[PDB]
């Protein structure tokens, strides 16, 4: 109707105003500023440990806060806790549902979370007098499959699903404290800030969004992609993030200046991107592709510095330890690898 | 070199490895089937006859089946369809008693064309190059009752036939089967079922036996 047309025109002219404001604040590009810096030499990393025991595809993996323990998730119905130093096994948890796409490790070290294709997020308690791992809480309030889950503390969790909505939960009660809405398509990845006051989330409508955990509404929105968004992660500083799509391209965004800074693409790459992570100093950007090998990029010069090629299938998960000492990689060949 | 506790830790690791290997050899004793459909295509009737995500277990002639129904997902399909990459077979359902009905969202498109589009999407997927498809055509009695009152030209305006039950059924089956584009690596099985039957389990049993024999031949290098 007439009201709909006038409101659409209003939205269009707000969009024009926002575009003009974004264009006004762009004085220079990152390429000129970083031209004079000394490039990072070619980096060689070698497989220190190899992990065996999975009999299916490996989808999730998350480090711990002590930089020695990690958890791995596969569709064999098993969640395995490893010891990277001695290549032992501490716990093997059977799962009720074998369709898992995410896993998370509590910062304290007492709980572990998992879920997928069941619209339920399960919490497992490790430290028990009885001597076994038991279920502690099941969160079932979503409509689509869960894509990612992360811990804020021992009594708070944040979840993203394919029902276009994200949620904040309370473990002791089991009810959604806040619900974040505003996207258009599936939500695939979310990243928490180190200061735990904000979090970013990427969606399948080629858009990334910032959300405030406490108040409960979107702050900023970012566009610029051409296909789905698969991975997202925060810079160590907390004023930037990097995102990866299905069109063989990565981009870096800032929070204070709502603009796109640098893009990572190469002509020889025509495959997708699955996982993205940084280093401890924020100088290296590790990416996993569909072409069976991972790449390392210089986060400020967009120059390839090395390739980790030791897998036979797609790389599905990638992580970096808190101490910044090792890199963990997983794949569909049922093998984990620590690189150093 | 190891301490008095490192030896016990390594023993625990060996026990966990043994349990994992023992449990992994029992999951290959199971035959996995994935079921697809279009909502009103007669899914529930076959689920109740042959006995987020629904999982069903049943046994027939010493063969154990694990059936996955994922019709209640309502999300983007190409973000979770690679999970079922190594399933034994796909059970597809088409309601051919819906050639006259029209979609609720749009009055221009009918349900049969939607089913054909979804079948074309599933059959020519990159994750199902060598996966068998068992096609069930549902509600034939209602179709034979409806075909006399109303012609079948609405669904297929390029059809010239006797306008009887057998010719219409054969035409529908042929039109569905020409959608395949491999015809050498993949095999398609078609069957006509109504509300009351007793032979569907035998059909799926024969299909899965053929698939098992083919896989065994391929494993040994004799195929």
């Amino acid at each position: 109707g007439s009201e709909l047309d006038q409101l659409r025109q209003e939205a269009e002219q707000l969009k024009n105003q926002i575009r003009d404001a974004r264009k006004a604040c762009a004085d220079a590009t990152l390429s000129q500023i970083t031209n004079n810096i000394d490039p990072v030499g070619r980096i060689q990393m070698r497989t220190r440990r190899t992990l065996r025991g999975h009999l299916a595809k490996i989808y999730a993996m998350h480090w711990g806060t002590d930089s020695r323990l990690l958890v791995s998730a596969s569709q064999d119905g098993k969640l395995i806790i490893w010891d990277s130093y001695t290549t032992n096994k501490v716990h093997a948890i059977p799962l009720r549902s074998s369709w898992v796409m995410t896993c998370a490790y509590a910062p304290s070290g007492n709980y572990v979370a998992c879920g997928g294709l069941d619209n339920i997020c399960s919490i497992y308690n490790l430290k028990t007098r009885e001597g076994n791992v038991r279920v502690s809480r099941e969160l079932a309030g979503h409509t689509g499959y869960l894509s990612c889950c992360r811990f804020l503390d021992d009594n708070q969790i944040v979840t993203s699903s394919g029902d276009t909505t994200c949620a904040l939960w309370d473990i002791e009660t089991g009810q959604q404290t806040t619900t974040f809405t505003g996207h258009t398509g599936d939500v695939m990845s979310l990243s928490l800030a180190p200061d735990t006051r904000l979090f970013v989330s990427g969606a399948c409508d080629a858009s990334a969004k910032l959300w405030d955990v406490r108040e409960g509404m979107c702050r900023q929105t970012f566009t610029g992609h051409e296909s789905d968004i698969n991975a997202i992660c925060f810079f160590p500083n907390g004023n930037a993030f990097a995102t990866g799509s299905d069109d063989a391209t990565c981009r870096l965004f800032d929070l204070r200046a709502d603009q796109e800074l640098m893009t990572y693409s190469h002509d020889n790459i025509i495959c997708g991107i699955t996982s993205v992570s940084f280093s401890k100093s924020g100088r290296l950007l590790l990416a996993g592709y569909d072409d069976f090998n991972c790449n390392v990029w210089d986060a400020l010069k967009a120059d390839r510095a090395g390739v980790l090629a030791g897998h036979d299938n797609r790389v599905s998960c990638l992580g970096v330890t808190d101490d910044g000492m090792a890199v963990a990689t997983g794949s569909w060949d049922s093998f984990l690898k620590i690189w150093n | 070199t190891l301490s008095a506790e490192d030896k016990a830790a390594v023993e625990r690791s060996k026990m966990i490895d043994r349990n994992l290997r023992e449990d992994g050899e029992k999951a290959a004793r199971e035959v996995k089937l994935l079921l697809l459909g279009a909502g009103e295509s007669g899914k529930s009737t076959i689920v109740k006859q042959m006995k987020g995500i629904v999982e069903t277990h049943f046994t027939f002639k010493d063969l154990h089946f694990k059936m996955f129904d994922v019709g209640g997902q309502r999300s983007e399909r190409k973000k979770w369809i690679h999970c079922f990459e190594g399933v034994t077979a796909i059970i597809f359902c088409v309601a051919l008693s819906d050639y006259d009905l029209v979609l609720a969202e749009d009055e221009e498109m009918n349900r049969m064309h939607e089913s054909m589009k979804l079948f074309d999407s599933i059959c020519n997927n990159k994750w199902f190059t060598d996966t068998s498809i068992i096609l069930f055509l549902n509600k034939k009695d209602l179709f034979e009752e409806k075909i006399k009152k109303s012609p079948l030209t609405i669904c297929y305006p390029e059809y010239a036939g006797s306008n009887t039950y057998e010719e219409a059924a054969a035409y529908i089956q042929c039109q569905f089967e020409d959608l395949n584009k491999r015809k050498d690596t993949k095999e398609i099985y078609t069957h006509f079922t109504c509300a009351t039957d007793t032979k569907n389990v035998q059909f799926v049993f024969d299909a899965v036996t053929d698939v098992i024999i083919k896989n065994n031949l391929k494993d040994c290098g004799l195929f």
Partner: single-chain antibody
Amino acid sequence: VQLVESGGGLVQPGGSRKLSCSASGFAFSSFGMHWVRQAPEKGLEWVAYISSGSGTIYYADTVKGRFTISRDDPKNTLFLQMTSLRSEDTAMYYCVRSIYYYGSSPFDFWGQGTTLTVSSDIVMTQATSSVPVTPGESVSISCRSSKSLLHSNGNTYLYWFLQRPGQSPQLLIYRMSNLASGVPDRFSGSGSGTAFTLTISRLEAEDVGVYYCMQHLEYPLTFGAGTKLEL
């Protein structure tokens, strides 16, 4: 969680019995099991050890070849078989559970004890034998070894446990730096190399008893003489 054992009666200088303990409240199949012997009005020493899966079995030199150990997982019961009892094997026996992985706390539950009456190795030395104390003040106890307990992996295997009059021992500190579960934050431990110390900041009426220090580098497990703390 509890462990109840029985089977301790009077014996002649020539004879045989067998002791049995039943667990209830935890997963028996994932716990290794021990036996500890304490002479009347004396200290306590180790007897044997059985691991999970019945793969590793260790005995003591003093009683090697004369006793038998056996475990039944489906019925959740541990046995001990006596063949020919001498006159020095008159004491009270205790049963202990332990689990070994990264971050575990072995020797966590001690259960109760049963009485049996008849008719190289690293030595733990605690010079002190009795200390009077007034509630509300700090206490410090020292335990000395004959070899450095620090292993190259970074772990130092020392264990501190308490014994009240008419009760069973309870774990306080394992690996001489970590505090157990279910105990107040008053106790603390420290030490380096050959000498180690345990400190209590504030003393109350429940801290009276005898304390022990135990080592775990290599078998057999050797305990030290108790350090009584009277009111």
